Point group: D3
Chain length 278, copies 6
């Protein structure tokens, strides 16, 4: 019916992967790389390209139907939005951190100057612990704030952890947020579900591999525990053996394959896939 | 028998894709990138690398057996050649165009200075309309010929259309030619058909994806209308459902997949393929 | 005496040029590109690498002695800081802009939704005009805010103007700010002046060329009006002619050279320089 | 049990492919590209990154369990090591070569100055022929040693052969060694076999494609001679035809496909695979 | 007065150097790289970007005032144009060439199939020798025309000569044309001379270095024979020695410097320059 | 007279800078990047491109006249060669190093397993200290030899020191060798001195800048102590001031310039130079 309005990051580390997913999903790409909008007349969707912080606000306020942004940003925004899908890129860990030497606990955070780019996120986490501290807002590069003499500890996005160790800092406590890129919606229904199914179909193509193997009937129980599938594993025969098909995660596939080999599975074969409509 | 003689573009936008297709087809690649020839002794084919305009002429005159070049160039050459295969890259649209503001029709072209790099193509198109105009031959960059004051309208290769809008020009009329890279032959037969089948097998691997899904017998009719296949869809069972396999175009696969989902299809799964011999 | 504390942008379009100027000025470069600090023990200066918005704040509050950031950011910060030097890169124009078709004036801005990443800058400019409007804060990509339906006009950083024309917007009014990268100070004195003189010496090496020419005594008056120099032009003899030396701006040197040729100057010769201590 | 110790080349043409195979095999990648070691605590393996010549020695002497290096290097090392797997990259041919014009035979090598980076390899090959010559050790660039006037012929690594022809040299005799990257072991058993199976599973994914086709029962015999498979070809039905599945080498697949087409095979379809556990 | 119209190559090996010279000369650069025109309102010149062959024609016919193109193209065009300036890039040698083995002379060209992209150039050269041959027009890649069996010898652009030797061809005879990029004019005068002087000033900055040295009065005669200068060498004193200044070619400067050292010159010092107005 | 024979590294970090110096010195560059030799017929010099270790040997043994290689390699070779020139690139520090925690001295090296790629260098350094240790030869990557359990300390090439700290190692003692690229000769004279003077002229152009300033006669003494020059500073007048010219090192120029400013110098101006013949 009415044209759907979808926002994607214009720039930075969440942009290229997001525009890759949208192109794989069949959506019309931008005519020039300096465009901040594109209209796809075949699929009836208008795309806007914005800074990630603004994406959460305008899904929240209803000016956009969907957005792609970081989970941590959403956690920090306090916008009226629900996470509709996890996108499998841009992943990071949000962590308390402080100077090395002392053994640090969450309890040590009391009465401290804490620097972060995500003040609402942090204020909310401190309230759940019952801790009063003074939270200092930076725009980024927050892990030099303690060498700069503006803070005692930090709360910051961590990827590898190289930046922390290169600056003599140790992460402590459980992560406040485990972040990855997410498709958000405000907290034309068929069209909305259609878009979600397209995007999910691509994500599943990126995250899962198809496994084919022959397994003994003897071992079938253990095998389905090892490979449950995204959908019900196809199972068919052939004297006492069976042939199996199941989507499995790409991350774990060698470990999965070794376990199957360890319970008598044979002719184990992994292959890529492109899209799902499950 | 006798060694086949095949020409490919030496340089420019039709070269790399053509040499990619030939390598995927198993043919011996060039030993140094500054070579204009290579002999493949295993497959009994000699390759020459030439400017695209010359490729059409020498297939025409019999010095080459096959060539790879642009359809628009062939349309313009007037060489004795038949298009044996379409190659799915280098695509473009050949268009009349003129300055914006006026509403333009093909009839407005009468008595006008028309600039183009493809004069024979254009002379032939004007004759079919019954229009007399004066056609001006440029070597390229033809869309500045009207700001230069040498022409009133143009006939030119269009891709995105950015160049036209950046120069205040609007395309009008139906395209004179829809171009893409093509394998040509002059208008040793088993060997010739063998080469065509290799090259086609690669092209099909690039253009189609394999779709697997379960469909209700109820819906089978509509489903085969949605997925006819390059070859007859494989269909087999399983109470009232069936399992299907069909090659479908890569361009349309998300749209195709949504339609199948809309008629009760399930476990729809798209995967790449590399080669066909159909 | 005490080690000076200097901040530079960590990332983005103001970073590489700033670190280039500091290396040319003899300062110790970063040991790893993921470092946010470096200490130069020979020159007695500690460098911090931060987000540009934060640079202005911490020079303002005294935690830093000097910073390198954008003039527009400083105009927007309202921090207690004076511009000590202009750095000749990162230049831009800050502009009101609105949809094309209407003829726009500053007076049209009254009662309007204005989107900008620089709200304080804009609030201050509107107060000087006597205009009440509603200023909307975005984080960036502000020129799609009117196609998005969140604003009537914008106030934004403009470089080429391509983004504005690609989105059907026209800049109007005088620029609110003409921006370039600047060395700031809070609004150890010998050491501070030493650092400024180093940095200025590099900037002058980038912006000026040395001109040597022979000029008639006849024409000397007009010539010194054309070439005043950064310092007093060196002038010496040689019957009735003189030989001149003067630093001139790199931007204008061909125009300057033509004017000198037009008043009888000869053997006009421009050459680069690397550093000044003037 | 005990952590396995595996060495890979740190740098050069055997490094990136080796680290690609290890990442595809699920092993933990290096945290920084200037690291010479990484410990994978999930899979219980420690990786070291060394110069290729040293890899063979320390597998030989027991300080490493496995190494990845070149076969020619191993042939030259005389270390106590067995080749456990061939890795399908870094391939080369080790060749005698001498100046063009004369017709060269292995017998001509007697009494000659032979330059090579692989003296033990060459001394051993000469002993098997019964030839006494004087072998000269270079560190590399050995094909200029004859223009330099330090040798009469050479024994050297050959890839394309461009370097030889560009220096007026002709390869002669059979290759002393046909080299490619190999996984070596000293000449915790379950863990060792597990690592080999992972690495082999990746290599097979790189070297083979899956072929699906329909074949007449008439032709089945010839077809299985054309496609024997890495594993037993799957064969099932369907009036008089059969459907086949067999892994075939990627290098030969178009030739293989043509032969099958020539014996009445139909719907021949090649597709990639990622991993095997056979 | 009237705006000057100047054409530059749009693409290929003569484009970037030409646009570099124009930017160094102070002229307004293109706003987007896909533009075929730019108007410089400060300097009162309009630039067009065209294919090199067309540049010569439209200077010839008066639609352009100046063009930048290759000398060989001009030699081939037969357009009414005079070479106003040589630009010191795009240099090449136009050569007859034929298969190796025979000793070739210009006289051998009689009665032969000669392939070339420059037929008028070649027809004119043959007429001056009194030779009748049949000249065959290709669009390029002409050095495979003899392996293709369409020609006995060629006339073609030669740079390094690698392409010729890689295809078993030897250049013979004197070059028909020694080519480099040139500024052409049709065969508003002050403005035209102004543009030429700007462009020449840049070219001289690229081709010459300033030499400063002390020379004995004894040796002055030999020294001025070694360094005549673009302009009169500046000469001044200082017991029996003199100090010299002279622009010399960049290509020969080490040879020049050695000769001066060989006649007792001292403190010889070469330095770059940027622009001349001589 | 006889053609000089000069060797340069074929590959790696000493190659590009060496071939840059030779091209700037006017010598004929390689026709194809896969060539191991080039003959310069104008300057009467033949160039060979070899592995750096072999360069030292063949200068030593007289097969080459000059070579370019690393000082540390020469120190290690024990070839009959004298360092004729230092080339100002490829610089490094050769260092003992061991695991962090203990305070290390040279005396601690006694009875230890020391790993190094430079065993002769190290054996010689230990003999001068009177220390017996066991030196272990690696081909490279030597700083993992202690985590590998093959050595207690190392002697290795150090650049930044990142590799050492990333592997928990501390450098100790004075450097055994301070290395940079060097022009070597065996320990046709005019031609040899000519080549050295060319190469030195380029190196000086890379390492020094020209300084011009006005200095008080008052301060002249201190000023010439600050700027002694590569050659005698030119000094001339002008009431009580003087004007100075002196080549100074590029590395120290801002420090030098500040000191001059501190003793009343004015109009201090640094500029590049290209070549010297001093
Ligand atoms: N190592 C990392 N450092 C910082 N952000 C990361 C990292 N890894 C992933 N991210 C994610 O990137 C997202 C933010 O993207 P980006 O940095 O482009 O936005 P921004 O911070 O608003 O812009 P900018 O960094 O240009 O100021 C966050 O959701 C964050 O979790
Ligand atoms: N946007 C485009 N502009 C021009 N040609 C295009 C475009 N897209 C596809 N093509 C195709 O490229 C082919 C011509 O290739 P190419 O431009 O390399 O040859 P050419 O014009 O003879 O060479 P050159 O452009 O170097 O003078 C034509 O068949 C044309 O349709
Ligand atoms: N075309 C342009 N667009 C945006 N900013 C520009 C442009 N040209 C120059 N700049 C300058 O860049 C500076 C801001 O740099 P930068 O964009 O890296 O900081 P930021 O906006 O805080 O970070 P980010 O863009 O990653 O969110 C400003 O002073 C601005 O004037
Ligand atoms: N064209 C080639 N030239 C040289 N080596 C090759 C070639 N092709 C493959 N190789 C392989 O590369 C391996 C050696 O790798 P590499 O050259 O990185 O080691 P190295 O010779 O010890 O190091 P370096 O070359 O840096 O001195 C050998 O097994 C060799 O067969
Ligand atoms: N090695 C070379 N090969 C071909 N042309 C060269 C070479 N070196 C210089 N040139 C010059 O380049 C100019 C032609 O440029 P260019 O090849 O871009 O034009 P074109 O031949 O019309 O276009 P295209 O090659 O795209 O068909 C000629 O003046 C020619 O002398
Ligand atoms: N950080 C560094 N690490 C190693 N060598 C360096 C470094 N910096 C400079 N060099 C110099 O490089 C020279 C050796 O060059 P190179 O590494 O190319 O030769 P090689 O070790 O024989 O070859 P390869 O490293 O390919 O086995 C030595 O003189 C060394 O001092
Ligand atoms: Mg930001
Ligand atoms: Mg960020
Ligand atoms: Mg062309
Ligand atoms: Mg073209
Ligand atoms: Mg910004
Ligand atoms: Mg080596
Ligand atoms: Mg090697
Ligand atoms: Mg050309
Ligand atoms: Mg090395």
């Amino acid at each position: 019916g009415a044209m759907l309005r979808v926002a994607v990051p214009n720039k930075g580390a969440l942009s290229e992967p997001a525009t890759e997913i949208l192109a794989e999903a069949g959506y019309r790409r931008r005519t020039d790389s300096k465009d901040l909008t594109v209209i796809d007349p075949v699929n009836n969707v208008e795309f806007f390209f914005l800074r990630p912080k603004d994406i959460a606000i305008y899904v929240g306020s209803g000016e956009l139907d969907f957005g792609i942004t970081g989970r941590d940003l959403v956690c920090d925004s306090g916008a009226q939005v629900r996470e509709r899908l996890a996108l499998g890129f841009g992943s990071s860990s949000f962590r308390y951190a402080a100077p090395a030497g002392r053994n640090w606990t969450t309890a040590d955070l009391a009465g401290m100057r804490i620097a972060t780019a995500y003040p609402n996120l942090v204020r909310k986490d401190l309230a759940t612990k019952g801790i009063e501290a003074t939270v200092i807002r930076l725009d980024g590069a927050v892990e030099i704030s303690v060498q700069l003499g503006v803070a005692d500890a930090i709360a910051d996005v961590v990827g590898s952890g190289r930046t922390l160790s290169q600056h003599d800092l140790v992460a402590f406590g459980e992560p406040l947020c485990d972040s990855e890129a997410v498709l958000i919606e405000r907290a034309q229904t068929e069209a909305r579900d259609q878009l979600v199914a397209r995007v999910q179909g691509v994500v599943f193509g990126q995250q899962y591999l198809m496994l084919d193997y022959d397994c003994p009937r003897s071992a079938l129980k253990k095998a389905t525990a090892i490979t449950p599938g995204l959908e019900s594993p196809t199972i068919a025969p052939d004297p006492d053996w069976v042939a199996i098909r199941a989507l499995v995660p790409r991350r774990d596939v060698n470990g999965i394959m070794d376990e199957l080999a360890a319970i008598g599975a044979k002719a184990i074969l992994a292959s890529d896939i492109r899209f799902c409509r499950f």
